[PDB]
């Protein structure tokens, strides 16, 4: 366990998985967790599983229920799996494919496939079960920022870069990306009771809200003090957005970008968020400050 | 042969990952001295006092592989030039302690991207860095071709671009340009060229003539692979290899492997494999391979006596003297009758005969031809006269006379039927042959033949902003600041660009009948110049016609192979002077003098003006 | 070890020479270049026209060997300073041609001798030639003691004298002085010191003492012979033969083999023997044999960070840490009574922790003491602290706690029981310690010890020719053209005369009470000069109070065996300042100081004043 | 108030000339060291053995008049830059003797003209020259506008042009600095800027600001005639001058009297005239009169 706190994502029954990275000192390197106790988190000795990663883990996802797809510092995207009853968690894949750090990975609306972001500019589609890579995307022309799969639909994405490129992305067309209309994009979220939209946020602390078919910014607020680094939609048919950033806080947003909630209990970066399913007024944020934070929200 | 780098931007532990690189076979490590993920806030609480440690300790190495094996880079992340004011201010502060922290542990060089216009700022924090506390080394990583501009042309409303912009395609150099001529021309600021999948325009390539590169970064990406499942390269990356490795550049290798199957010292492989592939190098290279852009001030034979050791480098040209030889045989030929063989014996005099080697070639001459001649060695220089007396007592006999004298001031007893001279500099005249035949060319006989007949100087524009470097470093104290500008140099020229082709600048005639005779000169030149480029100075080449068809030359175009005793000069510009595709450089030359000196000055007229250079000779003469 | 030469005045093969004298086993050898019976005329008709060769030729031998082996020789007949116009005029010519002569075949050496008082004239010829043209170097063969002092006193008319001239018997030096101060120092200019049978007084060597001996001429006739039949010397002559190593001499034998049953060798053996048999190098010896009068500007700890590696360095100093180990220890114990060992925790701080050595040092000390201590270790240098917060995690764990701030800055949790500092310099105060300290005593408790406790700076008078001239080719390009001489060196003075005790010049204590603090300071010194002598500048040394009897010191009399971590400062003086036997050296020193940086200023007011040296810092500040 | 010389190219005696323009009221003379027409010859035989003297003697005038009162002129022959090899070389001699001659004589200054595009090898004399011995000017002439560029339209096979060049139509501007440029911005070269009856854009005349003009030089010919008879300029014109009042030039005037009913005070009457008429110096100004572009270092009050 290192204290550079970077993932926190819920499943189904509600356990906690976290990726961790050393981002100091001797040893460069990251750790994924499970934790069936969310409120035995960060405590090691207190988890039901835990592993050893050679490199740091700058983003993960859950593949379903069991699988964990690990963006890693390496340049590899890894496949990890619930195993031994959910007590060990073992490499399934490693592949070497991108040509610097993997910033983002994202997984399609199926399940089988995800796509992976990276600062050597590129695109990846991936089969899970294949392990190969299907498709390369040299789209952008800086490093990708943040790639988010459409939730019901295994051929549509975003993605952003600091080229300042938002793209939609649609694998049926020939060309495959479009251009849509500002201070470089961080961080992406799909809406999940509409499709065409989505919010973004800035490295200005700014967040907005975006509908595809018009590519006309609906609205925005000046939220964070700093980037923003995630976004994130509460599991109520009417959902609240989590906001983070390095300013150290999170704030939660109605569907108007205006404040309800706001959090300064992080002293470092704020990382990662994720709403519990057994209750969906729990938030639970994680940070560089090695902090993990209960959110009750209004 | 080839010295090689792994670039990495994922390091777990330092030492397994430099020996698995040192294994690997390669040279040094570019890596991160922070983590690139790392981002630390300057300004606001309270993310600006995260607790240390900020990063890892410099007791993880030996000294002796700080100043050796690692080549730092900057976080990706840390960006100066950003459009933020908070992100501006922070990327600042994280520059100067990264760069700092690289200076604490020894680095021999650092690593700074490239990857747009505006790098202003990185640049007054670059300079302000450079002005502060050593002898490291800046590596600018520059794409050869802008990301933006070999990306998919998959954005279906955004299509990459089908028609050529000439000027467009050479914007990485703008970049770089720009950036260095803000940072006042460091020579702690070199480039790191990064080199991708497609090759833009050869006038794109040769932009990059005359800059100092000292690296050139090749992506795994960038490697086809053959039918046994190795890693190779393009005929037309080849090529580009073989012209970096003229350059002596340090190789870099970056990416992950995309030949699982091969390992990853099978792309240094191809690299290794490459260098002995070059093609030999030729008779005038393997000479001056350590004077590669290396200036000397050409000094005054007239008024300075030359050392031993320099004679005897000189002696040894074998073109040289060959062609000296049948330019002498094919004259008695031409002078001497066959019946006439033994009634007629040419007088030869060799002026300037230094250590004799113009005397033997003379001897050779007269054997093979088979006639008779009668020598005079005629030298100035009194420690080679030496020479010449201890050749003349043991070998050569009553045959030769030494004259130990001046050439100008020698009393003759007789006339010459032929005068053999080696005056000659790189740029023909510059050694003052002009003046000295001439006040020689008294005791030639009325239908006398002087060898060399006739020279004349060449001149080309060049781009080098290395050697416009190197001269600038050549201030001294108790000068003008910048007499080292007004004053030409000898220099095997490398590291440069030639803009447009050498034209003749000025002639000489021996024996000069003329009643009236002037060695002064005035010349305007116009080249057309057909690329985008910076005009930094003139090269400058001869070529003499010995006897006939017997000739020396050092023009490239023309050069006698083999022929290593004249390297060719450079006559530099204070002010360098861009030229765009099309333009013409139009430059000035005057040869001027008084009864004690000689000297040149220049300008350039087109499409700009330069000062007039060494106006009076004040910060350039040659001694008569 | 020993690098030596033989001396030779008749050659008749320079091969069958050379080779005779390399089996010999010398490693080059010093020989006439014109024979040295050859006289040569240069106005006068017939004898001008004597045809040459005038000499040997260059051919003889590889540009190699002539620039390697072979030191030339003045022909004795030439007199520049002939009383006879005619000889005076010829002379001239004779040394121009022998001088341009050797240059011409590049001798890395030649020699000239000093064998009267006036050689105006000769230094005037030798002065154009160095300013004509390289760095080849001139040898001035000076008697230790002049023929005319050493002559058998057998003319019964002319008694030698038996009473005692001080200063007569050191004419030979005044020669040489009289020549170099002519030839305005050049550093083409050395002594090849020339050793007779009978020795002079210790005070006419020591004259010599801080002059640029490049070789020691050896006659075989000095050699008495042992009871084997051997060649050796008399105890005398070794002592000096061994200081004359310490100079790494070139030593030259000359002479012809007196001990004719022995080879040419034997001599040369014996000084191989002397060589080893030297005594053998101290602690503090075996450290800077390569830093020998190398001079180092001092830099700022203040305003500059230190780099690793010199960190890394200075850590290793065994008794640096062995001292400060020990001091703290006794000092736990007289805070601490037996009874309190666990009820009372000492607060240290070391203030300046670097990489930690004192850290560590204060954790031995505790656990030797058997007593408990809380440490802050605080430290400016961001990229050291780096270092510290690696080691805090790893190994020392929350007693430790790395405090990232200047002293005189830093707000503190508590109070300190001991303060614990490293930031002394090589004249003790020169780093700052006394602004660091007491900026920072406001958090020492009310009775709190610092260690150091006190220092005190020493200075002496030296006289070094060689160093002066070190300082004096400091000069830079865009600042003052004497500023080299108005600023402080760290040297491993080596080469140079102490010319009086060194006598304390400034001291500090802390903690310091007074209410009105001033670190200003202004001194004067008094030094008693017994030899007649050059002065040239001070050495600077300092001792300190650690705790009590733990003390460290570089002063030469109470050196810290074996400790390197300190080199001597020198002040160089603008111009020289003759020193009579008998004379007080009268010395001035001021610490000045505004709110900005800290500086030194130096004048000498007996015999003769200096200017001050370093008015208002304007060549040289130390930044607060 | 107005610091003025007249231009003469014809002086058949130096001292009635120069009483004669005293007389008229200017302050100094322009004139030639030797004869306009007199060609030299430097190699060539027998032309170069011409018996001397070549010019007249410096005992003609007090040394305290030739170093305040004349203003030498290049002979109008000497042509440094001509594509004839023979001529290039002749007045390379012949420009070197004049400048020599002027030095010697201790003039305060001297014209050259720039007629051309090309005077490269004239910058390079007379850069020889600046390094060769003084505080001594040199007065470039450049016609604001080329003489090519005003001619009448009267060659009926080659029209003056009319349509409008923006750079064209500032060429002379390219001309002196192209040559201040070649000669590395000598303080001691300054511009005689030469001023004819049609004035160009407003561009073209705002294209001399900020260089170094130390005279103006007035046609006779540019003076139009009032009703009484005088001489006067053009408003135009007048604008041109009271510009140049604030940049304290001296005035030169040449050509023959035109308003020969009339006397050539007259000329520089209008002048002084028009300086009197110089609109009233504001509060700002009045101040600052002597520290008109003084470089002063900032120093730290603090
Ligand atoms: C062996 C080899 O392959 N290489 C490649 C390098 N070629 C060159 C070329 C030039 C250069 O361009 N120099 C100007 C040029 O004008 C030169 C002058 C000259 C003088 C003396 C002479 O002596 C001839 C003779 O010897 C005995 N007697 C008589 C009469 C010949 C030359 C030739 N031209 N300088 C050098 N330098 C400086 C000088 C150092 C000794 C060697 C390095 N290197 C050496
Ligand atoms: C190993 C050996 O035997 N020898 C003989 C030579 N002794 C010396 C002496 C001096 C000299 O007099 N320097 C001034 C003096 O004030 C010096 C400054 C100082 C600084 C830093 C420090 O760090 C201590 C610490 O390390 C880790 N943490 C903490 C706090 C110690 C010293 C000691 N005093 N300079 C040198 N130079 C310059 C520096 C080059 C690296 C080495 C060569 N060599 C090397
Ligand atoms: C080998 S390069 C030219 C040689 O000619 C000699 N030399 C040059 N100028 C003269 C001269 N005017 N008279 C005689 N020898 C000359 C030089 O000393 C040198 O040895
Ligand atoms: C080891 S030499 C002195 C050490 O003390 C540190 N130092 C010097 N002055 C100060 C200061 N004022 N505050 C803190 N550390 C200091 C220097 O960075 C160095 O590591």
Redesign the pocket.
């Given at each position: 366990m290192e204290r550079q706190l970077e993932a926190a994502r819920y499943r189904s029954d509600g356990a906690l998985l976290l990726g961790a990275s050393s981002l100091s000192g001797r040893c460069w390197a990251g750790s994924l967790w499970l934790f069936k106790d969310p409120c035995a988190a960060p405590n090691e000795g207190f988890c039901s599983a835990g592993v050893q990663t050679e490199a740091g883990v700058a983003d993960l996802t859950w593949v379903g229920e069991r699988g964990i797809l690990v963006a890693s510092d390496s340049g590899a995207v890894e496949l990890w799996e619930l195993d031994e009853n959910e007590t060990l968690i073992v490499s399934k894949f490693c592949k070497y494919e991108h040509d610097d750090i993997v910033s983002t990975v994202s997984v399609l609306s199926s399940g089988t496939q995800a796509v992976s972001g990276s600062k050597d500019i590129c695109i990846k589609v991936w089969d899970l079960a294949q392990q190969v890579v299907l498709s390369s995307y040299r789209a952008h022309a800086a490093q990708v920022t943040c790639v988010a799969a459409s939730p019901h639909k295994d051929s549509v994405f975003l993605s952003c870069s600091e080229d300042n490129r938002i793209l939609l992305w649609d694998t049926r067309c020939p060309k495959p990306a479009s251009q849509i209309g500002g201070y470089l994009p961080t961080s992406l979220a799909w809406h999940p009771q509409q499709s065409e939209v989505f919010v973004f946020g800035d490295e200005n602390g700014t967040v907005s809200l975006v509908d595809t078919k018009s590519t006309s910014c609906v609205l925005s607020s000046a939220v964070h003090s700093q980037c923003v680094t995630g976004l994130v939609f509460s599991p109520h048919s009417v959902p609240f957005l989590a906001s983070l950033s390095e300013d150290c806080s999170l704030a939660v947003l109605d569907s108007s970008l205006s404040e309800l909630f706001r959090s300064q209990a992080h002293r470092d970066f704020v990382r990662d968020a994720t709403w519990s399913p057994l209750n969906h007024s729990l938030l639970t944020t994680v940070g560089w400050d090695h902090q993990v934070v209960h959110h009750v929200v209004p | 042969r080839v010295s090689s780098g792994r670039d990495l931007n994922c390091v777990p532990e330092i030492a397994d990952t430099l020996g698995a690189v040192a294994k690997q076979g390669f040279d040094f490590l570019c890596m991160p001295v922070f983590h690139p993920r790392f981002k630390r806030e300057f300004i606001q609480e309270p993310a600006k006092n995260r607790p240390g440690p900020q990063t890892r300790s410099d007791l993880l190495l030996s000294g002796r592989d700080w100043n050796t094996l690692i080549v730092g880079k900057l976080s990706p992340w840390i960006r100066p030039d950003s459009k933020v004011e908070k992100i501006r201010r922070n990327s600042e502060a994280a520059m100067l302690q990264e760069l700092n922290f690289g200076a604490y542990l020894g680095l021999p060089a650092f690593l700074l991207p490239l990857n747009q216009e505006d790098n202003t700022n990185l640049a007054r924090v670059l300079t302000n860095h450079i002005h502060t506390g050593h002898s490291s080394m800046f590596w600018m990583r520059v794409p050869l071709v802008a990301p933006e501009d070999l990306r998919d042309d998959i954005i279906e409303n955004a299509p990459t671009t089908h028609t050529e912009e000439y000027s467009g395609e050479e914007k990485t150099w703008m970049w770089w340009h720009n950036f260095r001529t803000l940072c006042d021309y460091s020579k702690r600021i070199a480039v790191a060229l990064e080199i991708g999948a497609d090759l833009p325009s050869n006038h794109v390539i040769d932009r990059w003539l005359g800059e100092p590169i000292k690296a050139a970064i090749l992506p795994t990406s960038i490697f086809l692979t053959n039918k046994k499942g190795f890693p190779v390269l393009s005929k037309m990356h080849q090529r580009l290899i073989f012209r970096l490795l003229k350059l002596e550049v340090q190789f870099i290798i970056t990416g992950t492997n995309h030949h699982s199957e091969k390992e990853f010292c099978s792309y240094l492989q191809y690299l290794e494999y490459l260098s002995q592939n070059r093609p030999p190098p030729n008779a005038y290279e393997?000479?001056?391979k350590g004077?590669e852009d290396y200036l000397?001030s050409?000094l005054q034979?007239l008024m300075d006596n030359?050392?031993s050791?320099?004679?005897?480098?000189?002696?040894?040209?074998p073109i040289?003297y060959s062609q000296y030889q049948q330019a002498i045989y094919k004259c008695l030929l031409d002078r001497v009758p066959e019946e006439e063989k033994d009634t007629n014996v040419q007088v030869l005099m060799?002026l300037?005969?230094?250590?004799?080697?113009?005397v033997n070639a003379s001897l050779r001459a007269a054997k093979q031809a088979d006639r008779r001649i009668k020598l005079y060695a005629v030298?100035k220089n009194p420690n080679?006269v030496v020479?010449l007396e201890n050749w003349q007592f043991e070998e050569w006999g009553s045959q030769v006379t030494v004259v130990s004298s001046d050439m100008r001031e020698w009393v003759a007893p007789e006339k010459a039927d032929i005068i053999v001279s080696?005056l000659?500099?790189?740029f023909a005249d510059?050694?003052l042959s002009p003046e000295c035949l001439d006040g020689a060319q008294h005791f030639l006989k009325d239908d006398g033949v002087s060898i060399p007949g006739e020279y004349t100087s060449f001149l080309a524009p060049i781009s080098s902003s290395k050697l416009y470097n190197e001269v600038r470093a050549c201030r001294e104290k108790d000068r003008d600041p910048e007499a080292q500008f007004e004053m030409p140099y000898?220099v095997?020229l490398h590291n440069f660009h030639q803009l447009s082709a050498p034209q003749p600048c000025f002639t000489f005639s021996h024996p000069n009948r003329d009643p009236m005779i002037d060695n002064n000169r005035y010349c305007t030149l116009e080249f057309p110049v057909e690329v985008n480029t910076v005009l930094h100075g003139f090269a400058g080449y001869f070529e003499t016609v010995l006897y006939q068809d017997i000739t020396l030359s050092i023009r490239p175009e023309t050069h006698s192979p083999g022929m290593?005793?004249?390297?060719?000069?450079l006559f530099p510009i204070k002010q360098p002077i861009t030229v765009r595709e099309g333009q013409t450089i139009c430059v000035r030359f005057w040869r001027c003098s008084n009864s004690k000196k000689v000297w040149y000055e220049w300008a350039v007229t087109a499409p700009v003006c330069s000062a007039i250079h060494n106006p009076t000779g004040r910060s350039y003469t040659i001694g008569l």
């Open positions: - | 393997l000479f001056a004077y000397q050409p034979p030359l050392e050791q320099t004679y005897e480098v000189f002696e040894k040209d040289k060799v300037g005969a230094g250590r004799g080697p113009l030298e080679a020479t080696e000659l500099g790189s510059n050694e000898v095997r290593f005793s004249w390297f060719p000069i």
